[PDB]
Amino acid sequence: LNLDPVQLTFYAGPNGSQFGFSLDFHKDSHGRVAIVVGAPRTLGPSQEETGGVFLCPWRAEGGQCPSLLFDLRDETRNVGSQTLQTFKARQGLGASVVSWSDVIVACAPWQHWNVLEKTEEAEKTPVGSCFLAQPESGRRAEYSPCRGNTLSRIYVENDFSWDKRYCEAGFSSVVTQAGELVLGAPGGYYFLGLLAQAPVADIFSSYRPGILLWHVSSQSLSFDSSNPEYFDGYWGYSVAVGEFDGDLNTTEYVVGAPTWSWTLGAVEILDSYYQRLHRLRGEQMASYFGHSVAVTDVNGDGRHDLLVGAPLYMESRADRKLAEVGRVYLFLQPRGPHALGAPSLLLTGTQLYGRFGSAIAPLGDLDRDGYNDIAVAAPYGGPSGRGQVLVFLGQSEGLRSRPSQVLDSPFPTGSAFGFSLRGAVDIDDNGYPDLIVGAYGANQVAVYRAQPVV
Amino acid sequence: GPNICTTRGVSSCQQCLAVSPMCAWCSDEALPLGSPRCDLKENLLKDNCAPESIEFPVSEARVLEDRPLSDKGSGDSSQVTQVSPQRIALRLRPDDSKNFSIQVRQVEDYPVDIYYLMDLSYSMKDDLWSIQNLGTKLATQMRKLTSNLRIGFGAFVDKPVSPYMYISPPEALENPCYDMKTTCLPMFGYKHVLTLTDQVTRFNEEVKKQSVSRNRDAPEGGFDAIMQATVCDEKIGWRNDASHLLVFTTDAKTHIALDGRLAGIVQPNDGQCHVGSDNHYSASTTMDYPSLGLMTEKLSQKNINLIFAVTENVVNLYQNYSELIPGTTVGVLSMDSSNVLQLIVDAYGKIRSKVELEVRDLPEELSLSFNATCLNNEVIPGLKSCMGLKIGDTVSFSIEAKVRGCPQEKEKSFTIKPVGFKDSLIVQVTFDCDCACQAQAEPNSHRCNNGNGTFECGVCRCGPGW
Amino acid sequence: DILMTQSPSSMSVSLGDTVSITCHASQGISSNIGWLQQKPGKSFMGLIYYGTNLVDGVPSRFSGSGSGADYSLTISSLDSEDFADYYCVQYAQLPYTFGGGTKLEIKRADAAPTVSIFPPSSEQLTSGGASVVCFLNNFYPKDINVKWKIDGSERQNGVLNSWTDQDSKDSTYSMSSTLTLTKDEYERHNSYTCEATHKTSTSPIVKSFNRNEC
Amino acid sequence: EVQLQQSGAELVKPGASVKLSCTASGFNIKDTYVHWVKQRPEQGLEWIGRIDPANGYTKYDPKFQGKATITADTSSNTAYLQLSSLTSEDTAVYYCVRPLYDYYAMDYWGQGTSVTVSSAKTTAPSVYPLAPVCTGSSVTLGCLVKGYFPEPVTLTWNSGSLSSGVHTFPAVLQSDLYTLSSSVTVTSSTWPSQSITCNVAHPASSTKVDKKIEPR
Ligand SMILES: *[C@@H]1O[C@H](CO)[C@@H](O[C@@H]2O[C@H](CO)[C@@H](O[C@@H]3O[C@H](CO[C@H]4O[C@H](CO)[C@@H](O)[C@H](O)[C@@H]4O)[C@@H](O)[C@H](O[C@H]4O[C@H](CO)[C@@H](O)[C@H](O)[C@@H]4O)[C@@H]3O)[C@H](O)[C@H]2NC(C)=O)[C@H](O)[C@H]1NC(C)=O
Ligand SMILES: *[C@@H]1O[C@H](CO)[C@@H](O[C@@H]2O[C@H](CO)[C@@H](O)[C@H](O)[C@H]2NC(C)=O)[C@H](O)[C@H]1NC(C)=O
Ligand SMILES: C[C@H](NC(=O)c1ccc(C(=N)N)cc1)C(=O)N1CCC(OCC(=O)O)CC1
Ligand SMILES: *[C@@H]1O[C@H](CO)[C@@H](O)[C@H](O)[C@H]1NC(C)=O
Ligand SMILES: [Ca+2]
Ligand SMILES: [Ca+2]
Ligand SMILES: [Ca+2]
Ligand SMILES: [Ca+2]
Ligand SMILES: [Ca+2]
Ligand SMILES: [Ca+2]
Ligand SMILES: [Mg+2]
What we know:
Chain B: This is Integrin beta-3. Chain B: Residues 1-466 are extracellular. Chain B: Residues 437-466 form the I-EGF domain. Chain B: Ca(2+) 1 binds at residues 123, 126-127, 251, 335. The complex is a heterotetramer. By secondary structure, chain A is mainly beta. Chain A is built from four helices and 35 strands. Chain A is globular, with a radius of gyration of 21 Å. Chain C is mainly β. In chain C, strands 2, 4, 5, 6, 9, 10 and 11 form a seven-stranded mixed beta sheet that branches. In chain C, strands 1-3-8-7 form a four-stranded antiparallel beta sheet, with no helix packed on it. Chain C has a four-stranded antiparallel beta sheet with strand order 12-13-17-16. Chain D is mostly beta strands. Classes of the chains: A mainly beta, B alpha+beta, C mainly beta, D mainly beta. Chains in contact: A-B, A-C, A-D, C-D. The interface between A and B is large, with 43 and 33 residues.
């Protein structure tokens, strides 16, 4: 409703770096808000793509940002009559970034890894990896829970069980308020998908450089399965957290699995031991239900509600024809111990191939009426196909079914304006929460400041 | 007695005709003052109205092109008629309607293109062996149905990029089967092999030189190949006047739009051809798999009939995709493709067993209604599609067009075309809302309030600006 | 296998000293080394891993350094608890291999031993055996040699030695040597002697007795 | 807290077999490698092998191929070392080990399990008094404990009364049997003035003999 679309702020990265592929707000120890931006095709030392991270201080004028520096050198360790290798070429550092406390977590889902033992090998595969930084102190750490030193032949002899070689850890990421990092790994267990969790504090305290294979004893991984419903389901394509079991001492995980059960799609809610509390099934095959999940109480009852994006949902139209436009599903959490039911609201795109629902950002209470609000991206939407971000306001019965405000992309065609979103943080300290929108195809980020209601 | 034509107290010939399609107007000078000049045509002649001064349009419909339906789709360079009539003139007055007919034949001996698009991942090694003679065996059977067969061949595996592709050791890139006791081809996304030709032994011999590759994950990249086989007209060689059969064989799940992000690929599919002189799909490693909606768009654009010839273990899956891609056919493929010949023949029959009418460019103010005659002269009201047809059969539809009011533009044309057909019925519509007497109106007439008005059709009309 | 040559075998030092143990490998191990502590009559505690990294809970007066095939453990300002055994271990290759060990001992002023010889008891003799015992108590340093002589001539068969750990109180060492003969062979000779050779004297400390005589 | 709690001391005969246990306390045995290390005074430390309790895969030093077998039961959070066709040279202390952070390191150690391979039967000690020979200001006595099996014994003077100025030496293996000795020192005015006694308990045979030292 009251985002300012006239005076925007633009930050920009190098050409071709995909600056803006991911982003988040970041508060330093003093509460000063900055913006962390991931740029997953930034050039490394060897003039080869590795990805990179930028930490943009807040300025109404925007501009360029300093690097948040990470080690971009391939590593090798000869230990235990084996040879451990990391490969950072085309790893996509910055394909996800998330901030918690005064720490930044930036991940390289396609960092590759191999282990050599005489003539055998584990196989060079994308286990992914996450890099952790405390900018003010300079402290650094890594977390790569899917690395292993098992040789190829063993996986074959055991029929590929507990195969974490293609995890792509960091594909998605989130941190609990208590500071537990949770990583989506859509390729885990031969492309079923897994989740890896561990306290940030324990990640830092157990990390040392050059080890490459080390234990984080407080970590917790989800489980392989024999159920074909999960095969190639990419469990962990997206992740979030929230309170869904009525016990405030537990944190619940939300996991998107957009190809679950032969591309039907699904979203599951779990406890922190990965036991399944609910499952939301997709409505239409290949719609990629679960591509994005968002958690926020929109109807002001203090109970978190769940939003799910299916950006490829095909809407039914005249003469038995279908139109890919994307769809968003609202699930309101019922009072006390009860299942999430049918959706309370369906939001459906209008522009062909717009991918409405590709990203869903909680905004907090944008217009300050007592109900939290959301922003939905259609990165190829709008009458020109350049991208659109649509704002829907919360209300006692859930969400308004029509947008209160629409943001047309200020960038050229192909920018993917809205592919990444983040709201609910007041960057300029004016008492209203603001919205940052990434347009990685244009290598830029746009900041929309919220203003008093007209 | 009085009617809606008189009781409405109209002001002009134009307002008269707009009252009802039964109303008429008399432009005769010698007409009593009390007598209304907007009445039934009968009552005006009853009132001594000069017959030449009677304005009364009648909604009609006359054919302009009415070629007879062909008996054979053979011969000719497609001088073949499968819709009749091909063009008609339609004239409507305000709020009126008129009916016309269309005939549709599923012509006999129509040319056929069949492009064989084959999964060649490791599990299809035995399939390759059993289709080495398909080109000739298929020619034999299709010769009973058409005398203009062309066949071609293409193959797919998956995107040749990690993690779909094994990338270690170096030997594995040249031979993915190195860590077994065999050789297979380096991985390939989609490669065109044989352009559509009537020389079916070229199919056999190209197939005999084909071999499989091997990749890591069960879902394969067939949808990439369906897209390119659809939009690369010139390279596949689809003919203008021919049925297009795209035969898709696989024994596995398939990758779909947004799967590519697991290989670092986010660029949406652009639905354009990217197969060059090397006959390989060059955007395999840089462009995401296509979505169902985009596949649907292109299949429909190029009149491609997609056939999912898949194994029992994935029939339901592809049956469900088929429901999201109208016009697609599914058939059950044996684990070695031993039965693919009969599968194709059955598909072709099911493909030509339906006539479904479609309308293009219909004006907002026009509405249509259809009565269908299928099987044996049995009329089926409110229907615009027949099913259960056999080659050579013929159906017809009665059509009524109802215009609401009168639109600004007095001439528009729209199209009735059966789905997948070349021929079509063009309807040229003319909205007859004006009177002829208006073309000879007197602006600033002495008869009209000292020149303040205009004289048209025997009455005085206030001039422009008043 | 990789050989881990650890030096020195032992060292005598004092509280507050800064000392350094070294470990040399038969080939490069690229810091894949660990350091271990074993307090007297107890199990092992990890100190270092990957050459330089403290195990959790270890004081920072411990430090590890080195590279290639030569590494060092250093202890700044020795604590009373630090007098123990230390071992390196490499895990660059299987089989893992260990160093010989290094013992940190308390340094103190030299002390000559107190020698005491004891003839066989009446009881033991009436059972058919004969054991001469020789105690060498409370000396420093630890290095000492005991020689047995029967009728002036040396004897090496049947001798059985035992040493004590550095004494808690005075930080000295003591030794027990026992010569065991048959009764019949014990009586073939008269003179029995144990000579103690220490650095606290150029002349061996002699103590002896004569059978029958007293 | 990470703790490795090993089984109690074993006492077996040559040619037989024994199976030691290492139980994880405060963590899941499945988390890391578990190693076994043998320790002997002369030979020092020797690595036997490892197991990955998650999958049961093992490695061994070729020296221990045959004798050493390493297993694990995740159910009881325990790892095992089986030794076969036992021998005198198998007499040693055995530790289980796991890393802290580094997959390949050796940081946490169990308390260790003592093994003693012997054919000796349970034999009671012979205790002999050691009085000096027929002068100075200090006097020294002794006590000899010979030919017992198995270890250990306790030795005190005057039932723990006389404690300071004493040296009880480690037992030594003499032909499958053990021998131990203890010395004690005082002033000449104390002995033979005050009765000094050598108290030797051997629980294994349940024998507590006491020899008073008499001059000659
Ligand atoms: C391809 O697409 C088809 C069509 O959608 C899918 O088949 C359906 O699959 C769903 C999920 O397995 C089935 O849902 C179940 O319906 C049951 C009732 O159906 C009866 O009535 C129909 C009438 O058409 C009959 O055809 C059918 O055989 C039954 O007799 C319910 O009892 C089930 O409830 C249980 O499961 C759901 C979760 O799915 C839980 O929420 C419930 O609480 C309960 O535990 C279930 O809802 C559906 O019946 C199937 N339809 C048909 C016609 O088979 C294929 O799965 C799909 N295949 C692939 C590969 O994509
Ligand atoms: C389609 O069929 C319907 C009948 O099912 C036709 O409607 C009838 O037309 C006659 C014409 O004299 C009317 O008298 C009837 O009242 C109509 N029946 C109704 C309205 O139920 C209709 O004309 C046909 N349309 C076409 C285009 O053929
Ligand atoms: C080994 C693999 N394994 C899984 O797919 C697999 C593994 C684990 C789990 C699980 N963690 N439950 C599920 C599923 C598998 O089946 N094939 C190998 C890929 C093959 O394609 C080859 C080609 O066509 O070239 C299809 C068969
Ligand atoms: C219109 O319908 C009538 C019957 O209602 C029929 O006689 C006539 O032929 C139809 N018109 C055309 C052009 O077919
Ligand atoms: Ca909870
Ligand atoms: Ca709520
Ligand atoms: Ca609000
Ligand atoms: Ca603000
Ligand atoms: Ca096959
Ligand atoms: Ca595949
Ligand atoms: Mg396959």
